Amino acid sequence: PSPLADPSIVPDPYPVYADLAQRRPVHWVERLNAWAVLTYADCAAGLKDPRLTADRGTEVLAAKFPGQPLPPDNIFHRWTKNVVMYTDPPLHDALRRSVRAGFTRAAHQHYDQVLQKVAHDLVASIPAGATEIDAVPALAAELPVRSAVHAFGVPEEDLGFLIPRVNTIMTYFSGPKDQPVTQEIILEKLTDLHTYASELLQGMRGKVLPDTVIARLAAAQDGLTETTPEQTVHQLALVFIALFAPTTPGSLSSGTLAFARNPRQVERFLADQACVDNTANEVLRYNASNQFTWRVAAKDVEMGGVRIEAGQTLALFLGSANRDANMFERPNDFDLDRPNSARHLSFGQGVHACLAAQLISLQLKWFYVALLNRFPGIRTAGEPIWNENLEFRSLRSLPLSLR
Ligand code: HEM
Numbered sequence: 251p252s253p254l255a256d257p258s259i260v261p262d263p264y265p266v267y268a269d270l271a272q273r274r275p276v277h278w279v280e281r282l283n284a285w286a287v288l289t290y291a292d293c294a295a296g297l298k299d300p301r302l303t304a305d306r307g308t309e310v311l312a313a314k315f316p317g318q319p320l321p322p323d324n325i326f327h328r329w330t331k332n333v334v335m336y337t338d339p340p341l342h343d344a345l346r347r348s349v350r351a352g353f354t355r356a357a358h359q360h361y362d363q364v365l366q367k368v369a370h371d372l373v374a375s376i377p378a379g380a381t382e383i384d385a386v387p388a389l390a391a392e393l394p395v396r397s398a399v400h401a402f403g404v405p406e407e408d409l410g411f412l413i414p415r416v417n418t419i420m421t422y423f424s425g426p427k428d429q430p431v432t433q434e435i436i437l438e439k440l441t442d443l444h445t446y447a448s449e450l451l452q453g454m455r456g457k458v459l460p461d462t463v464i465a466r467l468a469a470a471q472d473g474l475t476e477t478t479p480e481q482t483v484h485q486l487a488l489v490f491i492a493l494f495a496p497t498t499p500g501s502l503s504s505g506t507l508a509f510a511r512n513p514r515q516v517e518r519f520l521a522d523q524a525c526v527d528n529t530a531n532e533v534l535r536y537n538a539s540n541q542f543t544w545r546v547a548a549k550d551v552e553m554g555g556v557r558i559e560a561g562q563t564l565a566l567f568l569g570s571a572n573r574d575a576n577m578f579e580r581p582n583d584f585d586l587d588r589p590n591s592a593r594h595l596s597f598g599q600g601v602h603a604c605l606a607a608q609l610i611s612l613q614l615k616w617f618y619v620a621l622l623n624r625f626p627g628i629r630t631a632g633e634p635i636w637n638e639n640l641e642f643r644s645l646r647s648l649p650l651s652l653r
């Protein structure tokens with residue numbers, strides 16, 4: 251029976267992952283209804299294997315809410331089948347092209363400057379007399395909200411509608427434990443996000459700041475030719491879920507803990523620009539916020555000495571891959587000088603590689619620039635406490651002393 255279903259692994263899964271990567275690199279996890287895949291080689295290839303489909307909403311819903319299927323007209327199915335995350339090419343590619351305007355090279359030039367300033371302002375807001383802070387609420391949870399506002403364009407006045415709704419939806423992704431919120435309530439909130447997205451574009455909600463992702467997407471709508479207005483609304487709902495997910499806070503807080511525990515890495519960061527430039531990637535490698543991602547077998551595949559049959563579900567453990575010593579020597583070292591940190595799988599790989607990958611790497615870079623030049627002496631001031639979630643793993647508390 252799999253140690254991956256043991257909630258006690260969440261604060262430090264890596265010794266278990268390393269053991270299983272060696273002995274049981276692909277094996278069954280009954281509480282996921284899926285094959286766990288633990289090695290870098292199998293995860294990286296699996297993400298790019300056309301025999302594995304992204305079309306998995308039915309299967310994953312069956313794993314998480316067995317006995318509660320939904321018909322094709324249901325919001326869950328209409329949403330999953332019309333967003334990039336859960337579609338294969340060709341539809342995937344039409345959907346991804348439809349959001350290009352938010353993510354161009356020129357847009358990222360602008361986002362670079364915004365995120366520099368936003369991170370600057372955050373860190374500069376910490377009062378002079380502060381030696382102690384809980385870096386989760388104060389920083390890790392805060393920066394992504396400020397980025398949502400200033401870079402993505404989510405109206406600040408609408409955050410009270412969005413943040414609790416995305417928190418509720420995200421309980422879908424609670425890993426191999428009981429679902430804390432009923433399916434019925436998740437679907438209500440998913441529906442609410444579609445109503446909000448549609449109304450936002452119509453000008454019935456808040457005011458979207460100019461030159462942000464959402465402003466650029468709004469302006470692109472008249473010229474779209476291969477996708478529908480419903481499809482924009484589905485895609486915006488996915489964007490809000492991703493923007494307010496614990497992914498970005500987890501990356502920020504786990505990287506902050508890494509620096510706090512590895513002061514010589516602070517020294518490296520402050521000495522060498524190449525170590526700044528590698529910070530986002532080494533932070534993302536060190537702890538994947540999304541520790542596993544789902545796939546379904548569209549055809550039979552053989553992985554890790556196991557024949558997986560068409561129709562079976564797979565859990566690709568990105569978090570284990572990232573610490574596989576066969577790819578990353580001394581994988582438990584947080585090392586800014588590591589030469590291949592960019593090879594991490596925290597954003598996935600291939601067709602579905604994170605749409606926001608550069609946005610988030612900018613956010614991380616600028617955060618650590620601001621934080622570590624202000625407070626190079628960061629250290630722990632108590633025990634970091636993790637959320638009870640393997641699937642989207644993040645710190646709930648990170649007590650620090652800043653000097
Ligand atoms: C540190 C923060 C983040 C992490 C760790 C993360 C991670 C990931 C991962 C692992 C995937 C691929 C999943 C798979 O193929 O199974 C992905 C895809 C995606 N990400 Fe993110 N991401 C984050 C932030 C964001 C944000 C803020 C957005 C808002 C736009 C976003 C939008 C997306 C989209 C739309 C996809 C799907 C791309 C496609 O299917 O072509 N991500 N991300």
Ligand SMILES: N[C@@H](Cc1c[nH]c2ccccc12)C(=O)O
Pocket residue numbers: 335491492495497540542543544545
């Ligand atoms: N791992 C998710 C996809 C995903 C990646 N990043 C996310 C952020 C928020 C919600 C879901 C996602 C899945 O298999 O379904």
